[PDB]
């Protein structure tokens, strides 16, 4: 499912991400835009052999089980395929854990390079929230 900007904003807010761990909604929407272009089915493979999955591009080396990333962890305790669903609950539950891990949103490389320090408020402009 390719989410619409405001559509996602609403879903994220509903799932308790606005101001989660001190990060305003604009940060979460900007991170999704740059990580997957709002596509829940996005997948990207890394050189280490791990893969990133979904809307938030969560990594198989540490967060989910994809059965093909030897010696990796499954901190979110879910199969990576669960992160590709049209329903973002699993992706959100897992993101909450990641963001609380010590590095904040820096865990998302697109966030650090394209969202961090920008006017993230722009990503929620005109949305009925």
The one catalytic residue among 7, 35, 66, 119: 35
Residue 101, marked binder: yes
Out of 7, 52, 66, 119, the active site residue is 52
Q: Are strands 58-59 and 51-53 parallel, antiparallel or unpaired?
A: antiparallel
Distances (CA, A) of 81 to 17, 32, 50, 54, 99: 22, 17, 14, 9, 21
Active site residue 48: no
- CB-CB contact of 36 with 52 (8 Å): no
7 is catalytic: no
Q: Which residues are annotated as a binding site?
A: 101
List residues with catalytic annotation: 35, 52
Annotated binding residues for substrate, written as ranges, equal 101
């Amino acid at each position: 499912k390719v989410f619409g900007r405001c559509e996602l904003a609403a879903a994220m807010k509903r799932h308790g991400l606005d101001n989660y761990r001190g990060y305003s909604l604009g940060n979460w929407v900007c991170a999704a835009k740059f990580e997957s272009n709002f596509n829940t089915q996005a997948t990207n493979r890394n050189t280490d052999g791990s893969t990133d999955y979904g809307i938030l591009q969560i990594n198989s080396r540490f967060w989910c089980n994809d059965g093909r990333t030897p010696g990796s962890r499954n901190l979110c305790n879910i199969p990576c395929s669960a992160l590709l669903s049209s329903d973002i609950t699993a992706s959100v539950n897992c993101a909450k854990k990641i963001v609380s891990d010590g590095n904040g949103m820096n865990a998302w490389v697109a966030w650090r390079n394209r969202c961090k320090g920008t006017d993230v408020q722009a990503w929620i402009r005109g949305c009925r929230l």
